[PDB]
């Protein structure tokens, strides 16, 4: 017999296959609020669901924000009011998605980690850095400085734990270094800090890559190629 | 700016943001103002609802496919069925909204001389009844199948009397009408004969070229596939 928790996991896997990510995220949110820990697979379903939901809002926000900037420069005041209203509508959806994820992290996921659950901890602290970073993308002024500080602090603790307890080739540690370097470059406008982090992570991993099996190698190199592409774009731009 | 301009501006923004539910909701509100749609407005309404219904259609095919291969846990199958029903009811609501718009405002307010609008809207009516027929069963299926075919049949008669065989709307109608026969009616010979006669009538009379030839190529691909 399929229990209640497994019925929610079934809903989210079906929602994923149907590309119905609001449905997926709602199912994973409910799984989390059962106050039972998430397996490796469960965490990935949680992350996939909210990445797609917030990602759709971020993409729409960048398009409408770009139209808003162009409308303002042309001084079309009546049109700008209508564009601003839509950009703010999308922004509020984006912020609510982010606040929901952060509440799950603070009320459940990070809260229930024990100190030896290093993978869980890094995964969840990285994801709190990610969703504070998404809030930072749409904020300005003092509001922005608040979520930027929260993002950095989350990334920093995640990376200290990852360095102490994960191999440099581990895809979650690689993914965290990547997103942390992206934080420095796009959020803090700190190219040198960004490149230093990304290059340290790439070098630390590539020296131990030869010791992986074929599956683990593919996962690590995929992320390592991304570090490499950013390093190139960032040093040139 | 009045309501009409507010809504039109919202739907163009929604289009650019790829938020087709917002786009459709705005275009629905525009149509409900009971004023004619220009050609640009008509395409906004069509693009919006094609995308909304297409997401549901695509999701529905996935879960129904899982439901098929699920016969193999009574309780696991039950949740798959219930989810496909959830999607199915979303799809039916979308189709019925469109169909209500076409019947309450768009087709009704066509003047006898606006044959282009008439063909386009009745073709649209055939399309959304066909999307209902893709998921319906039993008696409800019979009703939407015959409603689909009656709409297509009327649009095709008007298009035959008032449009050249090279007209994109007439060719697009022949294409979808042939898909109705093939996919809904399981009538491949009737489907191939319609697609073949329309490609032939167009090629017999062939910048405007690129528009008609694009659809003629789709007719020929289906015929190549169906035979």
């Amino acid at each position: 017999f399929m229990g209640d928790r497994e019925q929610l996991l079934q809903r989210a896997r079906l929602a994923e296959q149907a590309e119905r990510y609001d449905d997926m995220a709602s199912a994973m949110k409910a799984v989390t609020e059962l106050n039972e820990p998430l397996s490796n697979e469960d965490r990935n379903l949680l992350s996939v669901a909210y990445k797609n939901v917030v990602g759709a809002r971020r993409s729409s926000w960048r398009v409408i924000s770009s139209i808003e900037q162009k409308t303002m420069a042309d001084g079309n005041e009546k049109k700008l009011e209508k564009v601003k209203a839509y950009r703010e509508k999308i922004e509020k959806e984006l912020e609510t998605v982010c606040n929901d994820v952060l509440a799950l992290l603070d009320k459940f996921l990070i809260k229930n980690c024990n100190d030896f659950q290093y993978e869980s901890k890094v995964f969840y602290l990285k994801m709190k850095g990610d969703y504070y970073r998404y809030l930072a993308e749409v904020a300005s002024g003092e509001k922005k400085n608040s979520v930027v500080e929260a993002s950095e602090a989350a990334y920093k603790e995640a990376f200290e734990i990852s360095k102490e307890h994960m191999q440099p080739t581990h895809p979650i540690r690689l993914g965290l270094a990547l997103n942390f370097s992206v934080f420095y470059y796009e959020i803090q406008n700190a190219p040198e800090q960004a490149c230093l982090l990304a290059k340290q992570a790439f070098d630390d991993a590539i020296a131990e890559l030869d010791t992986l099996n074929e599956d683990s190698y593919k996962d690590s190199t995929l992320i390592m190629q991304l570090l490499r592409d950013n390093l190139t774009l960032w040093t040139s731009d | 700016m009045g309501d009409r301009e507010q809504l039109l501006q919202r739907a163009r923004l929604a289009e650019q943001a790829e938020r087709y539910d917002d786009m459709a909701s705005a275009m629905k509100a525009v149509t409900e103002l009971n004023e004619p749609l220009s050609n640009e407005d008509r395409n906004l309404l069509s693009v919006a609802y094609k995308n909304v219904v297409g997401a549901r259609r695509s999701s529905w095919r996935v879960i129904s496919s899982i439901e098929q291969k699920t016969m193999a846990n009574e309780k696991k199958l039950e949740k798959v069925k219930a989810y496909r029903e959830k999607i199915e009811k979303e799809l039916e609501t979308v189709c019925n909204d469109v169909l209500a718009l076409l019947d309450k405002f768009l087709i009704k307010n066509c003047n006898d001389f606006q044959y282009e609008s008439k063909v386009f809207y009745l073709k649209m009516k055939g399309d959304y009844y066909r999307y209902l027929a893709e998921v319906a069963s039993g008696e409800k299926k019979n009703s939407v199948v015959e409603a689909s075919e009656a709409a297509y049949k009327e649009a095709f008669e008007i298009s035959k009397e008032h449009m050249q065989p090279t007209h994109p709307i007439r060719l697009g109608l022949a294409l979808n009408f042939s898909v109705f026969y093939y996919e809904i009616q399981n009538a491949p010979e009737q489907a191939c004969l319609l697609a073949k006669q329309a490609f032939d009538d167009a090629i017999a009379e062939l910048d405007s070229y690129k528009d008609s030839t694009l659809i003629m190529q789709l007719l020929r691909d289906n015929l190549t596939l169906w035979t």
Binding site: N179, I223, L226 | L175
Partner: peptide, 19 residues
């Protein structure tokens, strides 16, 4: 832009109806 980002066989599916 630069952060960590099979049904992607979708672009090869052929639609029968008008696009």
């Amino acid at each position: 832009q630069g952060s960590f980002r099979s049904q992607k066989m979708s672009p090869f599916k052929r639609q029968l109806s008008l696009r």
